[PDB]
Ligand SMILES: Nc1ncnc2c1ncn2[C@@H]1O[C@H](COP(=O)(O)O)[C@@H](OP(=O)(O)O)[C@H]1O
Ligand SMILES: Nc1ncnc2c1ncn2[C@@H]1O[C@H](COP(=O)(O)O)[C@@H](OP(=O)(O)O)[C@H]1O
Ligand SMILES: C=C/C(C)=C/C=C/C(C)=C/C=C1/C(C)=CCCC1(C)C
Ligand SMILES: C=C/C(C)=C/C=C/C(C)=C/C=C1/C(C)=CCCC1(C)C
C-alpha cells in the first residue's frame with residue numbers, strides 16, 4: 023500500500039555528542055525521522071513503512087502517549103471497562119493483554135552480544151527467559167497486530183506520534199491519548215531509563231533534561247508529539263486526557279473513559295475501579311508492575327516501573343537555572359495554541 | 367627575596383608595525399623582556415618577579431617547551447608514568463592535572479570587554495563558562511602553584527625560558543623539555559594562533575613566518591629559548607627531547623622519560639603507553655584535545671588543538687624564497703654550537 027512519505031537523517035556532530043554522552047553505553051542508536059525530527063531507535067526503520075500502512079479494525083482500541091504519561095493506568099482502565107469489569111481475567115500480564123506496537127524498536131538483533139554488557143551481573147540472568155525477551159523484541163509490531171485473529175479484540179499500546187501511523191486511523195479505531203507536565207515526564211523518563219539501563223550511570227538528571235527538552239530523547243520532540251494528538255481531540259474516536267486529572271479526579275476520569283467507550287458504569291463500579299487504581303495497590307500488582315522482569319535480571323536496583331505516582335515532583339530535581347529554561351521552553355511551545363496543562 | 371634582574375622595552379615603530387599588522391585585532395599587546403628580548407604579553411610583567419622567585423619543591427615536575435613542540439604528549443606520558451600508569455585517573459582534563467605557569471598572560475582583565483569582539487558569534491557564548499575561563503586566566507601562575515598543598519605532587523606546564531624562572535631550579539625540580547623543527551613549530555603555531563582567534567583573519571602563513579623567525583611572536587626569539595634548555599641538557603634533572611623522535615621511536619622515548627622520572631617500565635607497559643599516544647586516539651581523547659572549549663564558543667571552525675601530528679609538513683607552506691630564508695636563519699643560529707635536530 024501507500025509509500026512511506028518520510029526520510030530519515032543521522033544526528034549531526036552536536037546532537038551525536040550529547041546523546042552519546044548520556045546513552046552511549048546502550049547499544050541501540052537513534053535516527054531522526056520525518057519533517058519534525060522524531061527520535062526513533064534505528065531498528066524502527068525496518069518496520070516504519072509497515073506501521074504507516076497497518077490494517078486496522080473497527081474494534082481496535084489504542085492507548086497512546088508520550089512515554090511515562092499514564093499509559094499503564096489507562097490500559098488497565100480501558101481493558102477492564104471493555105471486558106465488563108472482569109477483574110479475574112485482568113490478572114494476566116498487561117504485556118500479554120496489549121500489543122506494544124513500537125516496543126520492538128529498542129532492540130537491534132545485530133547487537134545481541136552487547137545488551138548483557140550493560141548489566142552489573144550478566145552472569146545472573148535467566149537465559150531461557152532473557153533470550154525469550156530478545157526474541158519477542160525482534161518481531162516487528164505490525165506483525166504482532168496482524169497475528170491477532172479478528173474474533174479477538176485487539177488492545178494496542180504505543181508511544182508513536184499520529185503522523186507515523188495511518189492517517190485517518192481515527193476513522194476506524196478508538197484511541198485514548200495521555201499527556202502530562204513535560205517536567206514530570208522528564209523525571210519519570212529519567213528514572214525509567216535508569217530502570218532498564220538505558221542511561222550511562224555517570225550522567226545525571228540535568229544531563230537527561232538537556233537531552234529531553236532539546237528534542238534528543240526517544241520519540242521527542244515532546245510538544246510535537248502532544249500537538250498532533252491535541253489537534254484531533256474533538257474527533258468522536260479520540261480521547262485526550264491529562265495524567266494530572268487522574269490524581270485530581272479518578273472517579274471523574276473513569277466515567278469519561280466509559281462514556282468514550284460506549285459503556286454504562288454504576289457509581290459503585292466506578293468506585294470499585296477507583297480502588298483498583300489506588301497507587302500502592304496497583305504498584306504491588308504483579309500483572310502491571312513488570313516485577314516479572316526483575317527475576318530475569320534486567321531491572322536496576324532502586325528503580326521500579328511504577329514509582330511515586332505524584333504530580334509536581336519536578337521541583338525536587340530542577341535547580342534555579344533549569345527552572346527558568348523549562349519555563350521558556352513551555353512558554354514558547356504554548357505560544358499561539360490553546361493547549362493548556364490544568365496543573366500550570 | 368631576590369630582585370627581578372630584567373628590564374622591559376616597548377617594541378619600536380618597526381617591530382610594532384609588523385606585529386600590529388598580523389595580531390592587531392587581538393586585545394593583548396606585547397613587550398620585549400630581558401636582554402634576549404623575549405616577547406611576552408604585557409600582563410606577564412605583573413607576575414614576572416614572582417615566577418622568577420617562586421618557591422620550588424623536590425617532587426615538582428616541569429614540562430617545558432617552546433609551544434607546539436609536543437608539550438601535550440609529554441604531559442600525558444609524564445603524568446601517567448608518575449601515577450603508576452593509572453589510565454583511569456588520567457581521564458580528567460589535562461588543565462586540571464597540570465598548572466600552566468604562564469597561561470595567565472594572554473588575558474588582560476582591563477580589556478575584558480574586548481575579547482568577545484574577536485569571535486564570529488559572541489551571542490552564542492556560554493557566558494558562565496566563558497566568564498569562568500576569563501576569571502581563571504586572571505590568576506597568576508605563581509599563585510596556582512603556591513596553592514597546591516605539599517602532599518600533592520605539582521605537575522607544571524610552561525613555555526617560559528629558563529632565564530625567566532628561578533636560576534638553579536634544576537637543583538630542586540625535574541624538567542622534561544621538548545624542542546621541534548622551527549619550521550614545523552611555525553606552521554603548528556600559525557594554526558594554533560588561528561584556533562584561538564589570535565591572528566588577524568586577513569593575514570597568512572607568510573606574514574606569520576615573518577613575525578616568528580624575526581623574534582616577534584609569543585616567547586621568541588625561538589633559538590634562544592631552545593639554546594637555554596640545550597646547555598642544561600646534561601643536568602641529571604633535565605631531559606631534552608625532540609618531537610621528531612616521538613614519531614621516529616616512540617617506545618624509545620617513553621623508556622627515556624620513564625627512566626628520567628625513576629621508573630623501570632616493562633616492555634609491555636611501554637607498549638600500552640604508546641598505543642595510548644597513538645595520534646588518532648590522542649586527537650579523540652576528550653581529556654587532552656581541549657574540544658570542551660568548542661561548546662563554550664571560543665575555538666575556530668577548521669582548527670583543532672591536536673592537528674596533523676606529522677614532521678616535515680612545512681614544505682607545504684614555504685615557497686622557494688621562504689625555504690632559503692629559513693635555511694639561512696637556521697644555519698646562523700646553529701653556527702658555533704653542537705645543537706642539531708634529528709630531522710635535518
Ligand atoms: N495507579 C497509578 N496511579 C498514579 N500513578 C501511576 C499509577 N500507575 C502508574 N503510575 C505512574 O505513571 C507513570 C508511568 O506512566 P506510563 O505508564 O505512561 O509509563 C509513573 O510515574 P512516576 O515515575 O512519575 O511515578 C508511575 O509511578
Ligand atoms: N599523540 C600525539 N602524537 C603526535 N603529535 C601530537 C600528539 N598530540 C598532539 N600532537 C601534536 O603536537 C603539536 C602541538 O604541540 P604542543 O602539545 O606543545 O602544543 C601539534 O602539532 P601539529 O600542529 O604539527 O599537528 C599536534 O598535532
Ligand atoms: C513504556 C515503557 C516500557 C514498558 C519499557 C520497557 C521495555 C522493554 C521490553 C525493554 C527491554 C529490553 C530487553 C527485553 C532486552 C535488552 C535491553 C532492553 C533493556 C532494551
Ligand atoms: C599551548 C596553548 C594552549 C593550550 C592555550 C590555551 C589558552 C587559553 C587558556 C586561551 C583562552 C582565552 C580565553 C579563556 C578567553 C578569551 C581569549 C583567549 C582566546 C585569550
Ligand code: EMC
Nearest residue numbers: 332333334335337
Ligand atoms: C510540589 C509537591 Hg511533589
Ligand code: EMC
Nearest residue numbers: 676677678679681
Ligand atoms: C615531507 C612531506 Hg609532510
Ligand SMILES: [Ca+2]
Nearest residue numbers: 135136138139
Ligand atoms: Ca555479552
Ligand SMILES: [Ca+2]
Nearest residue numbers: 479480482483
Ligand atoms: Ca564585547
